[PDB]
Amino acid sequence: AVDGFAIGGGAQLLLVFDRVLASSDAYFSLPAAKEGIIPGAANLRLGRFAGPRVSRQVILEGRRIWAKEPEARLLVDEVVEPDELDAAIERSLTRLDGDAVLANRRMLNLADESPDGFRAYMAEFALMQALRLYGHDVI
Amino acid sequence: DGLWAALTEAAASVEKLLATLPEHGARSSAERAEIAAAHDAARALRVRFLDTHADAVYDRLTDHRRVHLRLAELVEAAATAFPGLVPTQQQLAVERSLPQAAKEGHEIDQGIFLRAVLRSPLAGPHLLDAMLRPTPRALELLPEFVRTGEVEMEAVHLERRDGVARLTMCRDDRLNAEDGQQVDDMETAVDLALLDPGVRVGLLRGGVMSHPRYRGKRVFSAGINLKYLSQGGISLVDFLMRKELGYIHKLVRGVLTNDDRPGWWHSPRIEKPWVAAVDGFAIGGGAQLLLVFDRVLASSDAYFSLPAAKEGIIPGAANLRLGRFAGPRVSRQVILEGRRIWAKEPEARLLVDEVVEPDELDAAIERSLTRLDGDAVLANRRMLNLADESPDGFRAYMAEFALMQALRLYGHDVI
Amino acid sequence: DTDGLWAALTEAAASVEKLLATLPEHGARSSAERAEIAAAHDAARALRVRFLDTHADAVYDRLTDHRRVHLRLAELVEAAATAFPGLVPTQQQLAVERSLPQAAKEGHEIDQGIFLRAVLRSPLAGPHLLDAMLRPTPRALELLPEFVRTGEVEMEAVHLERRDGVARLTMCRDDRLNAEDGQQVDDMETAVDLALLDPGVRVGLLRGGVMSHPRYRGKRVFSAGINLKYLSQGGISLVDFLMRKELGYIHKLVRGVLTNDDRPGWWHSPRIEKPWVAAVDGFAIGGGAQLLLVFDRVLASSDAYFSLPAAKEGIIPGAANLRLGRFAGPRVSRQVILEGRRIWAKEPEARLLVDEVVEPDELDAAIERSLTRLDGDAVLANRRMLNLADESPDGFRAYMAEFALMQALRLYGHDVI
Amino acid sequence: DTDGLWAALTEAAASVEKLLATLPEHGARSSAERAEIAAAHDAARALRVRFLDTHADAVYDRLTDHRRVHLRLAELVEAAATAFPGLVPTQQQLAVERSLPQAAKEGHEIDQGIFLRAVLRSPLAGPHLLDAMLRPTPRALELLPEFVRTGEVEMEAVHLERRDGVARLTMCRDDRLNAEDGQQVDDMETAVDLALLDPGVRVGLLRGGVMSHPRYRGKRVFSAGINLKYLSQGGISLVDFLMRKELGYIHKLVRGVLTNDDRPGWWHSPRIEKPWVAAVDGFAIGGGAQLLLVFDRVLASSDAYFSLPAAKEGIIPGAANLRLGRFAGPRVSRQVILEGRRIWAKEPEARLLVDEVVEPDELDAAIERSLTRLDGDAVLANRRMLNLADESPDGFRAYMAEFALMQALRLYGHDVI
Ligand SMILES: CC(C)(COP(=O)(O)OP(=O)(O)OC[C@H]1O[C@@H](n2cnc3c(N)ncnc32)[C@H](O)[C@@H]1OP(=O)(O)O)[C@@H](O)C(=O)NCCC(=O)NCCNC(=O)Cc1cc(O)cc(O)c1
Ligand SMILES: CC(C)(COP(=O)(O)OP(=O)(O)OC[C@H]1O[C@@H](n2cnc3c(N)ncnc32)[C@H](O)[C@@H]1OP(=O)(O)O)[C@@H](O)C(=O)NCCC(=O)NCCNC(=O)Cc1cc(O)cc(O)c1
Ligand SMILES: CC(C)(COP(=O)(O)OP(=O)(O)OC[C@H]1O[C@@H](n2cnc3c(N)ncnc32)[C@H](O)[C@@H]1OP(=O)(O)O)[C@@H](O)C(=O)NCCC(=O)NCCNC(=O)Cc1cc(O)cc(O)c1
């Protein structure tokens, strides 16, 4: 559930949950673009959520999607006024209970992101990131 | 006929129980029920008298539509020339002293009056024309403003620059929360802006806020001051009416000037294009005004509402305009169900023109003012308004408002 | 008299009077026999107009003791018939007419059309006749007390109910998909009237009940429009249905009912008005979808649509021509009306007439939460203000004037049938 | 008459007449000499107004034997000139004014603007001058028979052609991408009267024919704005084009043509109207897109765009300021009219001027299939009732009245040139 805002790792995590809720006053970004480091596994996942086009407007040009703009539905599931977010949230948890969800979830992930896919990506990350750490402009 | 005195004994009885009874708050139940019944018979009579004698009453107060009188002036003049028809200065004074919760609702009479006046195809266009003429305090500070280029006033901060009359809502305490003193600095900011030959385009925005929840950030407006509302600080006439017949109307049609300066035959009114920029949010009157500018800009983090729906009062002339902006369907989701359109949701484009990130709003705004310069804009603007909202349309609406609002003022739940 | 028209008209008709009297019924109609009856009619109706263009207010003043007695449509046209023979059909003529094969009638209702129009075009009569069809009907004034004590009233077309401060109206014609006719128009006005008066009703509700016909069994439909049956046969009445609907209850939903100078606060609120909510199941077609443009809040179920179908050969769909515009734009409206387009609840342009489009298994819940959001005494004030800005008393009056003679024309235009 | 506002005016026109006749030719004039002649015009025009605010109906009654003779714009202003010297330019002065460049003209048209504005504000002469403009023109009337015969007219601008009940208009001006001008407007109205009085036509269609200019060779092109070069050069007549085309043919596409009490049913339909379908190829700029705001069905190509370019330095974009808001809302219409926005065929908001958008490949078949959906009778009785609610008689006239003098002032505004 997103209150206020999801910037950076905050946003990165939203690409791994089964259901994302956010109050209408929210927005999301990774706006480390011109100087910051690589935003984790976002470069690996944001693609499958909002295409290569948006994916780059976000991560490369530093754009941010506002909770209420149409394109926010590529990342979030539900968007409601903060003074009803609580119930939106509760009524949410009770919908993913059954063991039917455990199975379907599990297959869906097997399709979205696979073992080789994550491994290959995390490999290059290990180094790429290192270097991006000790890089003049990020420092 | 003999309607007058009829009305008179009516205000008579009322005047009576106006002393015999104990302070409001300790009456009972044929105590209350009796004053209440009284008033009704009186106000009921105030109406019948005016339905047939408004034009007369108006003619006597203005030497037959020969002297333009602003709202305050007109109602006052009405009081001393027709005791019982509308409250006197002092009478109101007693009222304003008490808290909006315990008043006898004497404003409702001004509501019944001002209504009948605007309902006439003779008096109404005149009371209106009269509320379009430059405000004295404005003609007072004009020369000083023209030479200075800067006028500092409690709620508003005017400033001419590059041909722009930039107004800046600066309640560095209270989120520009409107109040009948702002409605004054505001109507003066507009006039000066319109009469300053050096101004071509107007700009309305919010200054930086001092309050902790918003220190260092601009805020457009938080609607009306809910506080003074309960306390008895929101004048039906001096604020709620003066507001819609005063500056807000000027932003549409301009300042009715005196036959002086070449062109008056084709343009008795000086109008200019205005541009509103929204920072943070436009709640209430803040939002209401956005339905009258030539160009609205807003940072992507903004939203708008009038979310007085289940208890509050009528949101000004919104009920009259929001329709033409977003259909009867949305119009009601906003005003009736209390919904708010977020700057970035698609439906925000029914109200705003441009929406950009706050760290580029400044340029979006500048590049905006330079686009409404030519005299081609003055003409096209003027015709567009003639189509969108017409004279009869506004008059009819403002009429019923005069009363409807009055009553919505002294209504249990709003209080 | 002086004018002269009253005699020209009095004779012009006198002619038709005879000509009809002599010639046989229709179809026998030798032949250009008709061209004569034709011309007779045209010269007569042409005269009915000129007379009223200059004497409507008078004629109206005599029928209502100078705008001093409120008379409903039926009453007014009847009163007109006996006091100005030739101007408008008599209870009898209409009888003869209302018992023939629509496609073979002289078209006397057209006379009723020329009257309703001139009467509404007048800024004198106009307001008065309409404030007369603001006023609550007798049937309801009569039924009110039992309603206040019971909270239940089973009528033929509608089923009224008071539950939780909500006037639940339920168009219940399951045999025809809530078709349309004078009894329906009579039950709806009565029902609406009862709602508006019941000091126990804060908000109104209109939904269709479950249908019993085999095509849509178990489910419920909002309305399937005007009963075509009864228009073919003849006999969708121009005055007891078409005009009544628009000036009576449909207009009450917008301005409330007009009460006598009884209660305290009349001087300021002569009419009792409350918000209304309409929920759509299955569909609204025809008159049904016409109503949608008068409701404060509106729900439909995902899998329905809204259309006014008669594009190429039907009639005029009431005030949908004065209202759709304000709702979806000049192109939308001409699409819906002129080219019979249909809109589905789940398509974008649907949010132009619908406030919420909710899965059928969730509709009950949505409806119930909306009835709880239009409570206040502010919502009543903001409602009255908004309707004033949308549909000014004048615009409506004007549109109804022409509609009465135009719908009348369309009600007989040979093609219609 | 007695209040002698006329002698003031008369008196004033002289001070102008003297100053001109005794001061050097325009550009030869000194700063002071400029300020003086200019001061005289203002005092004169200022007086032209005051006189008419109180005597328009009179002046109008004398020029038309008390609203008893319908006179078109040209006729009326001419008649006004000879019967009230000083009120409005004579044919001669208009002749001279034309001889020069916009900006050495004394701007006499402004007077015709003050005149036309006074007449239209009058609830008496207003609707009367407007009915005279709806009457069919002498040229059209002249050609009505040969059109009924041949089924084809071919004027310098348009090219009319009956075909299946369709009055196919085609603004063929390949030389200029169909830039409006004085003649173009004449043929347009003639072409529209023809389509309206020819019983053979049921549905009219406006479309731009193939171009002949190298840049566009081979492609059809709806419209490319008003003929500029004349705005520079002095061909745009405030009356014979700007006003005519609004009060004339463009208004006939809405209400049709007012006939005489000839054929039967005139008592209920004094005007003959029919549906229209414009089709946009390439683009629709200026006056062109102004036309789309009154059609019954707009077809547009995929590559087409719409705009009202007369933004920064120009003249009012026609009754567009009266209609645009109704199709796109106050924030649309200003973006388009004030800021100069341009709407493309394939973008979302194009659906709020256009009904269909199809690839040039198939636009041709599409236009056809729609030409056969407005055939109906209700499609006349729906059309007519929609246009009444869309744009009121008062509403339109109010606009026109202020347009006449606001636009007259634009022709001469310094920027425009
Ligand atoms: C805007 C808010 C949501 C901000 O929430 P926060 O971030 O929670 O800030 P807050 O801590 O609440 O407020 C910041 C600060 O501003 C003050 N503030 C905020 N809103 C107001 C208003 N409306 N008045 C006065 N002071 C205000 C608030 O009191 C705080 O100072 P403190 O009380 O000392 O703490 C909140 O302030 C709020 O809900 N205000 C209610 C807004 C409102 O409902 N206005 C009602 C509008 N109703 C009309 O305009 C009616 C109207 C107006 C007209 O002009 C004409 C007409 O015909 C009809
Ligand atoms: C709704 C439908 C599409 C349903 O299709 P199906 O699922 O195919 O059901 P059906 O088998 O056709 O009909 C089910 C059932 O309802 C009956 N039914 C359905 N519609 C009607 C109508 N309109 N009248 C009478 N009975 C009807 C139908 O006759 C069936 O019973 P049977 O005849 O014995 O079989 C169909 O019934 C239909 O097309 N109805 C036409 C709807 C229509 O065009 N109404 C016209 C509306 N035109 C107006 O309201 C004009 C108007 C009304 C006003 O109120 C005011 C005004 O000023 C103008
Ligand atoms: C359409 C264009 C963008 C086309 O660009 P291109 O492909 O670059 O073609 P061009 O080479 O410029 O023009 C092709 C050809 O058509 C001629 N042409 C194009 N537009 C015009 C106009 N408006 N007038 C005359 N001739 C024209 C142009 O002069 C060329 O011939 P040449 O001059 O000999 O070369 C261009 O022609 C253009 O910008 N025209 C300006 C369009 C314009 O602004 N019209 C102004 C509209 N303003 C109104 O209608 C105001 C109005 C009209 C009314 O009817 C009523 C009313 O109340 C108010």
Evaluate: CB of B180 within 6 angstroms of ligand 1. no
D127 and D141 in a common domain: no
Residue B120: CA atoms inside 13 Å, Cβ hemisphere, count? 20
Strands C305-307, D203-208: pairing kind: unpaired
Name every chain D residue with its beta carbon within 8 A of the beta carbon of B262. Answer: 38-39, 42
Residue C412 and residue C315: Cα distance in Å, rounded? 10
In Å, what is the CA distance from A116 to each residue of A112, A121, B109? 12, 8, 80
> C107, C135, C163 — which closes off a domain?
C135
Residue C250 and residue C189: Cα distance in Å, rounded? 8
Which pair of structure tokens corresponds to residue B69?
A: 């009188």
State the alpha helices, DSSP H only, in D225-267: 228-233, 244-247, 249-255
Which backbone phi and psi does D158 adopt, to 5 degrees?
-75, 180
Which pair of structure tokens corresponds to residue C193?
A: 């009237």
How would you class D100 by CB atoms within 10 Å of its CB: exposed for 0-12, middle for 13-18, buried for 19 or more? middle
In Å, what is the CA distance from C280 to each residue of B91, C62, C205, C285, C358? 53, 45, 11, 11, 10
Q: How many CB atoms lie within 10 A of CB A54?
A: 17
Q: Are C301 and C345 in contact (CB under 8 A)?
A: yes
Which of A58, A66, A76 to mutate against chain B (most B CBs within 10 Å)? A66
Q: How many residues does chain D have?
A: 417
User: Which residue type occupies D231?
Assistant: L
C243 and C171 in a common domain: yes
Q: Are D76 and D56 in contact (CB under 8 A)?
A: no
Closest listed residue to residue D177, CA positions, set D154, D210, D153: D210
In angstroms, how far is the first alpha carbon of chain B from the final one?
38
Tally of domains in chain B: 2
Which pair of structure tokens corresponds to residue C339?
A: 């080219």
In Å, what is the CA distance from C68 to each residue of C128, C129, C254, C261, D159? 9, 11, 24, 14, 60
Which backbone phi and psi does C114 adopt, to 5 degrees?
-65, -25
Alpha carbon dihedral B383, B385, B386, B387, in 10-degree steps, equals: 100
Name every chain C residue with its beta carbon within 8 A of the beta carbon of D385. Answer: 316, 321-322, 399, 402-403, 406
What residues in chain B have their Cβ under 8 A from chain C's Cβ atoms?
A: 37, 40, 43-44, 47-48, 112, 308-315, 319-321, 323, 327-329, 331-333, 335-337, 393, 396-397, 400-401, 403-404, 407-408, 411, 413-414
Residue C278: strand pairing partners? C206, C298
Residue B404 and residue B112: Cα distance in Å, rounded? 9
Residue B317 and residue B328: Cα distance in Å, rounded? 15
State the alpha helices, DSSP H only, in D84-227: 91-99, 109-121, 125-134, 138-150, 182-197
Residue B370 and residue B373: Cα distance in Å, rounded? 6
Name every chain A residue with its beta carbon within 8 A of the beta carbon of B300. Answer: 27, 66
How would you class B66 by CB atoms within 10 Å of its CB: exposed for 0-12, middle for 13-18, buried for 19 or more? exposed
Which pair of structure tokens corresponds to residue D219?
A: 């492609």
Q: Are B206 and B193 in contact (CB under 8 A)?
A: no
Residue A118 and residue A104: Cα distance in Å, rounded? 20
Q: Whose CA is nearest to atom 20 of ligand 2?
A: C224
Which of C49, C312, C402 to mutate against chain D (most D CBs within 10 Å)? C312
Q: Whose CA is nearest to atom 37 of ligand 1?
A: B222
B147 and B5 in a common domain: no
How would you class B185 by CB atoms within 10 Å of its CB: exposed for 0-12, middle for 13-18, buried for 19 or more? buried
DSSP secondary structure letter of residue B283: E
For CA atoms C204, C207, C208, C210, give the dihedral sign. Answer: negative
Q: Are D23 and D37 in contact (CB under 8 A)?
A: yes
Which backbone phi and psi does B317 adopt, to 5 degrees?
-95, 20
D141 and D130 in a common domain: no
In Å, what is the CA distance from D322 to each residue of D129, D337, D385, D392? 19, 11, 19, 11
Q: Do chains A and C touch (3 or more CB pairs under 8 A)?
A: no
Q: How many CB atoms lie within 10 A of CB C79?
A: 16
Name every chain C residue with its beta carbon within 8 A of the beta carbon of D297. Answer: 334, 338-339
How would you class C188 by CB atoms within 10 Å of its CB: exposed for 0-12, middle for 13-18, buried for 19 or more? buried
Calculate Rg over the CA atoms of chain D. Answer: 22
State the alpha helices, DSSP H only, in B21-159: 31-61, 71-81, 89-97, 107-119, 124-130, 136-140, 142-148
DSSP one-letter string for B122-182:
TTHHHHHHHTTS--HHHHHSHHHHHHHSEEE-SSBEEEEETTEEEEEE--TTTTT-B-TTH
Classify each residue of A68-107 as buried b or exposed e, where b means 16 or more C-beta atoms within 10 Å of its C-beta.
Answer: bbeebeebbebbbeeeebeebeeebeeeeeeeeeeeeeee
In Å, what is the CA distance from C204 to each residue of B404, C167, C293, C300, D334? 22, 5, 15, 16, 39
B228 and B129 in a common domain: no
DSSP secondary structure letter of residue C62: H
Residue B240 and residue B180: Cα distance in Å, rounded? 8
Q: What angle do CA D171, D176, D179 make, to 5 degrees?
A: 65
Calculate Rg over the CA atoms of chain B. Answer: 22
Contacts 24+ apart (CB under 8 A), B236-239: B236/B107, B236/B110, B236/B111, B236/B405, B236/B406, B236/B409, B237/B71, B237/B72, B237/B75, B237/B107, B237/B110, B237/B114, B238/B71, B238/B72, B238/B180, B238/B183, B239/B179, B239/B180, B239/B183
User: How close is the nearest chain B Cα to the Cα of C295, in Å?
Assistant: 9
Closest listed residue to residue D185, CA positions, set D94, D270, D73: D73
Residue A15 and residue A25: Cα distance in Å, rounded? 20
Q: How many residues does chain B have?
A: 415
Residue B196 and residue D41: Cα distance in Å, rounded? 25
Residue B330 and residue C356: Cα distance in Å, rounded? 11
- Comparing alpha-carbon positions, the chain A residue that sits nearest to B349 is A69
Name every chain B residue with its beta carbon within 8 A of the beta carbon of A66. Answer: 300-301, 342-344
Q: What angle do CA B252, B253, B255 make, to 5 degrees?
A: 120
Q: How many CB atoms lie within 10 A of CB C44?
A: 24
C159 and C96 in a common domain: no
Q: How many CB atoms lie within 10 A of CB A135?
A: 12
Closest listed residue to residue C177, CA positions, set C288, C305, C311, C302: C288
Q: With an 8 Å Cβ cutoff, are C312 and D352 in contact? A: no
Strands D283-285, D223-224: pairing kind: parallel
C126 and C172 in a common domain: no
Sheet with D166-171, side-by-side order of all strands: D161-162, D166-171, D203-208, D276-280, D297-301, D356-358
Strands C276-280, C203-208: pairing kind: parallel
Coil, strand, or helix at residue D171?
Answer: strand
Closest listed residue to residue D239, CA positions, set D129, D358, D161: D129
Q: How many CB atoms lie within 10 A of CB B75?
A: 27
Q: Are D228 and D193 in contact (CB under 8 A)?
A: no
Q: Are D179 and D231 in contact (CB under 8 A)?
A: no
Alpha carbon dihedral B84, B87, B88, B93, in 10-degree steps, equals: 150
Residues having CB within 6 Å of any atom of ligand 2: C 176-177, 179-180, 213, 215-216, 224-229, 242, 245, 285-287, 309-310, 314-315, 317-318
In Å, what is the CA distance from B245 to each residue of B72, B112, B152, B401, D205? 12, 17, 24, 11, 47
Coil, strand, or helix at residue D50?
Answer: helix
Find out whether C338 is annotated in a ligand binding site: no
B196 and B239 in a common domain: yes
For CA atoms D186, D188, D191, D197, give the dihedral sign. Answer: negative
Coil, strand, or helix at residue D11?
Answer: helix
Residue D107 and residue C56: Cα distance in Å, rounded? 48
How would you class B186 by CB atoms within 10 Å of its CB: exposed for 0-12, middle for 13-18, buried for 19 or more? buried
In Å, what is the CA distance from C40 to each residue of A116, B130, C12, C89? 92, 58, 7, 16
Q: With an 8 Å Cβ cutoff, are C338 and D382 in contact? A: yes
Alpha carbon dihedral C287, C288, C289, C291, in 10-degree steps, equals: 90
Evaluate: CB of B227 within 6 angstroms of ligand 1. yes
Rounded to 10°, the helix D109-121/D393-412 angle is: 170
Helix (H), strand (E) counts: chain B: 17, 13
**What is the domain-level CATH number for residue D281?**
3.90.226.10
Q: With an 8 Å Cβ cutoff, are A70 and B300 in contact? A: no
Coil, strand, or helix at residue C175?
Answer: coil
B328 and B199 in a common domain: yes
Residue A64 and residue A6: Cα distance in Å, rounded? 10
E-assigned strands of C265-407? Answer: 271-272, 276-280, 283-285, 297-300, 305-307, 343-344, 356-357
DSSP secondary structure letter of residue C357: E
Residue C292 and residue C302: Cα distance in Å, rounded? 16
Which backbone phi and psi does C64 adopt, to 5 degrees?
-125, 30
> D119, D135, D151 — which closes off a domain?
D135
Q: Which residue has tokens 């171009």? A: D211
Domain, as residue range, for D367 = 136-417
> B78, B107, B133 — which closes off a domain?
B133
Q: Which residue has tokens 């004009």? A: B142
In angstroms, how far is the first alpha carbon of chain D from the final one?
39
**What is the domain-level CATH number for residue C9?**
1.20.58.1300
Contacts 24+ apart (CB under 8 A), B347-350: B348/B298, B348/B303, B348/B304, B349/D331, B350/B325, B350/B326, B350/D329, B350/D331
Closest listed residue to residue D137, CA positions, set D194, D64, D201: D194
Residue B283 and residue B295: Cα distance in Å, rounded? 18
C178 and C106 in a common domain: no
C126 and C169 in a common domain: no
In Å, what is the CA distance from C232 to each residue of A20, A66, A118, B111, C101? 57, 57, 71, 54, 8
Residue C158: strand pairing partners? C171
How would you class D377 by CB atoms within 10 Å of its CB: exposed for 0-12, middle for 13-18, buried for 19 or more? middle
Closest listed residue to residue B249, CA positions, set B192, B219, B292, B200: B292
* Residues 6 or more apart in contact with residue D2 via CB below 8 angstroms: none
Residue C96 and residue C91: Cα distance in Å, rounded? 9
D278 and D246 in a common domain: yes
Coil, strand, or helix at residue B331?
Answer: helix
Which backbone phi and psi does C169 adopt, to 5 degrees?
-90, 135
Sheet with A65-66, side-by-side order of all strands: A6-7, A27-29, A65-66
* Residues 6 or more apart in contact with residue B90 via CB below 8 angstroms: none
Which pair of structure tokens corresponds to residue B373?
A: 């310069």
Strands C257-258, C203-208: pairing kind: unpaired
Residue D17 and residue D23: Cα distance in Å, rounded? 10
In Å, what is the CA distance from D194 to each residue of B240, B276, D138, D167, D249? 56, 50, 11, 8, 11
Which pair of structure tokens corresponds to residue B351?
A: 């109200």
Q: What angle do CA D199, D205, D207 make, to 5 degrees?
A: 145
Which pair of structure tokens corresponds to residue B293?
A: 């500018």
Coil, strand, or helix at residue B66?
Answer: coil
Strands D305-307, D342-344: pairing kind: antiparallel
